[PDB]
Amino acid sequence: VPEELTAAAAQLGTIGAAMAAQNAAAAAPTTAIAPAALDEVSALQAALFTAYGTFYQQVSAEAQAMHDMFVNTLGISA
Amino acid sequence: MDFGALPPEINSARMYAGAGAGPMMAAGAAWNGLAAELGTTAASYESVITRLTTESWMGPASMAMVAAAQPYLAWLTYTAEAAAHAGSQAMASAAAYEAAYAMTVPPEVVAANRALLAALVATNVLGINTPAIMATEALYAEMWAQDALAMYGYAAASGAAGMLQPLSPPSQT
Amino acid sequence: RTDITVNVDGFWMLQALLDIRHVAPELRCRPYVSTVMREQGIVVNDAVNEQVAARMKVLAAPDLEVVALLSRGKLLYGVIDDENQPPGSRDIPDNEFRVVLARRGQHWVSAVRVGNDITVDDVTVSDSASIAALVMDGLESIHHADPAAINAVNVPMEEMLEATKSWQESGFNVFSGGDLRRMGISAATVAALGQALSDPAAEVAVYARQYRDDAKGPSASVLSLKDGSGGRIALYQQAREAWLAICPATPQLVQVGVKTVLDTLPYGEWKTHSR
Description:
The structure holds 3 protein chains of 3 kinds.
Chain A: H1 2-25, H2 27-31, H3 40-76
Helix pairs in contact in A: 1-3
Chain B: H1 8-13, H2 22-55, H3 62-103, H4 107-122, H5 130-161
Chain C: E1 4-7, H1 8-18, E2 43-44, E3 47-48, H2 50-60, E4 64-72, E5 96-104, E6 107-114, E7 117-122, H3 128-142, E8 153-156, H4 157-168, H5 178-181, H6 187-198, E9 202-211, E10 216-218, E11 223-228, E12 231-237, E13 243-248, H7 251-263
Antiparallel strand pairs in C: 1-7, 2-3, 4-5, 4-9, 5-6, 6-7, 8-13, 9-10, 9-11, 11-12, 12-13
Helix pairs in contact in C: 3-7
């Protein structure tokens, strides 16, 4: 049923766009964290969570690429 | 260094300045906004591979497609938990700051005590005031112990809030 | 000998190993908040000498405390004139000696800070006399002074303090002593009190405090001794309006002044008292 396959192709591509969408929305608030105060604990805590949102931004980029393959590959079958 | 080795004038100057909880809760809400949208993206994969298998779009080999999708469906459910975790840990982080600000002696309350010490010394010509001079000194040491105990307790909780699940790309099953 | 001496950072290691937050504030150490020693035998393994540990536990929370601030020259009461003084500095003026004598139960422990060094020994004290004997044989080694050739005289507190504030503006000039002699004070007293405040050789300030259910309370009398070029003078609030006692620092009256301080304590019996 190529009328259901290609449907699942496009429906799942609009879910990956909507996912890419939230991914770049959360970029700035998860990676531009200023320290709450001017001590060493406040600095450490903000440096990690920004290192973490940065590392998340690559991991998600690499994940989406492989989602892009499955939507292509699923789509190819016809 | 050591926070307890620092006088109250420093631990509270450095705490009563800065950005507040604001940046951290914005981090939090963001992490929850992704935890939410990882899972809705997982719940609809779980809907298409689960109708693919059930209806059997490509016979005995419908499997092959479920297979293909698995490494990225796995990453979805695993990372959603990761993001919800960072969400609650961004906020745990900030409640740690807000508790340490609450207990840190305000900078003006410290210097007020210091100026009273200077005032009682200038007028202690007959030494009649010395017990207040040394009562003013004890109260300072109390502020010194309160600021230290606030910073040490802040450090402690920021460790428990600094704990994040390792993130990784998807790899083949 | 059964004494030890540590510097200010060493005293902190003591508080740390024993988990004591504070000592008397005249000692001016850092507080310990819940987070060479081995050579001179103060620490065995990871623990502290049992002897030194018991004395530290007195200073940590004593029922009574008796202090003596002494100075070679003008007692500066802790304040060093300096711009390069860091916030919260624990230095004391190089011309100051601090003496603390705490008592928990019937264990009397003296703590003496001179410069950056503290020494902690046991101390033997019985009545007012033995306590006055420590302060005097300490002051006498700072400076030898004969008592002022003045006569004792009682004086209204408030009026004196005010008269003294305005006298200082003159440099304690003997010409501006009018308001003092118009107050009952003999002439020679003014001469010796003048010199004792203008340019003093050594001052002492003796006071005390008591504790009951974690409630601090300082003596209502402070006993100040000053050494002029006209002898030594004792001043202290009499026991209680309020009246100041200006008399020569003789052995008798110095003992009386110390008895006054010790008996103006908020919760009574000084030799036997519990928190």
